[PDB]
Design a protein around this motif. Sequence first.
Motif, PDB file in Angstrom:
ATOM      1  N   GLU A  12      -4.144  50.982  31.103  1.00  0.00           N
ATOM      2  CA  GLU A  12      -3.525  51.397  32.483  1.00  0.00           C
ATOM      3  C   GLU A  12      -1.984  50.586  32.526  1.00  0.00           C
ATOM      4  N   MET A  13      -1.187  51.235  33.417  1.00  0.00           N
ATOM      5  CA  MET A  13       0.018  50.532  33.519  1.00  0.00           C
ATOM      6  C   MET A  13       0.082  49.454  34.133  1.00  0.00           C
ATOM      7  N   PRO A  53      -1.262  46.186  23.180  1.00  0.00           N
ATOM      8  CA  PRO A  53      -0.870  47.726  23.035  1.00  0.00           C
ATOM      9  C   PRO A  53       0.628  47.760  23.518  1.00  0.00           C
ATOM     10  N   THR A  54       1.302  49.211  23.369  1.00  0.00           N
ATOM     11  CA  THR A  54       2.688  49.323  23.712  1.00  0.00           C
ATOM     12  C   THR A  54       2.512  50.518  24.585  1.00  0.00           C
ATOM     13  N   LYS A  55       1.846  51.494  24.576  1.00  0.00           N
ATOM     14  CA  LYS A  55       1.643  52.567  25.767  1.00  0.00           C
ATOM     15  C   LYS A  55       0.169  52.912  26.089  1.00  0.00           C
ATOM     16  N   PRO A  56       0.125  53.310  27.472  1.00  0.00           N
ATOM     17  CA  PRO A  56      -1.123  53.575  28.063  1.00  0.00           C
ATOM     18  C   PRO A  56      -1.671  54.824  27.382  1.00  0.00           C
ATOM     19  N   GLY A  57      -2.651  54.684  26.476  1.00  0.00           N
ATOM     20  CA  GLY A  57      -3.578  56.137  25.965  1.00  0.00           C
ATOM     21  C   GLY A  57      -4.816  55.537  25.505  1.00  0.00           C
ATOM     22  N   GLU A  58      -5.400  55.537  24.377  1.00  0.00           N
ATOM     23  CA  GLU A  58      -6.763  55.113  24.016  1.00  0.00           C
ATOM     24  C   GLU A  58      -6.691  54.555  22.726  1.00  0.00           C
ATOM     25  N   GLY A  75      -7.408  47.840  29.329  1.00  0.00           N
ATOM     26  CA  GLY A  75      -6.532  46.641  29.673  1.00  0.00           C
ATOM     27  C   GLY A  75      -5.097  47.198  30.255  1.00  0.00           C
ATOM     28  N   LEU A  76      -4.250  46.544  29.942  1.00  0.00           N
ATOM     29  CA  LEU A  76      -2.756  47.034  30.161  1.00  0.00           C
ATOM     30  C   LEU A  76      -1.821  46.945  29.274  1.00  0.00           C
ATOM     31  N   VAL A  77      -0.745  47.745  29.465  1.00  0.00           N
ATOM     32  CA  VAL A  77       0.159  47.948  28.385  1.00  0.00           C
ATOM     33  C   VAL A  77       1.168  46.682  28.167  1.00  0.00           C
TER      34      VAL A  77
END
Length: 131
Positions: free
Chosen positions: A119-120, A92-97, A44-46
């Motif tokens: 993703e951002m 989420p809070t940051k683009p990761g896993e 998804g997105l942040v």
Amino acid sequence: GSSGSSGDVTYDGHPVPGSPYTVEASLPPDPSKVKAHGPGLEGGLVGKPAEFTIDTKGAGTGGLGLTVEGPCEAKIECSDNGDGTCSVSYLPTKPGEYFVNILFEEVHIPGSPFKADIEMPFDPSSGPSSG
């Protein structure tokens, strides 16, 4: 303190053509049948809402433990839909896993966790506008 306000949605359904005189709540918890498909799974997105569709109708009755095993602490909003599905949305809070651990009655379903690549988010339309 303070409070909010909201309405209420209405739905209409029909009982099984077999024994409609039952709460169809008499069945063993079959996780192997529990399927998880949706956008929230692939990613998804942040700071954006991400959820998916979970199939339980063909599983049984009990409980499901959802936990986001990510690098950060993302919130998890799990609410029932009524049509025999679960509408879980995470932010989420940051683009990761993020590994969505899906287990039914302390039983990890065949497919979890579900690595979701975030993703951002793109930028809004602003600049070329006059007004």
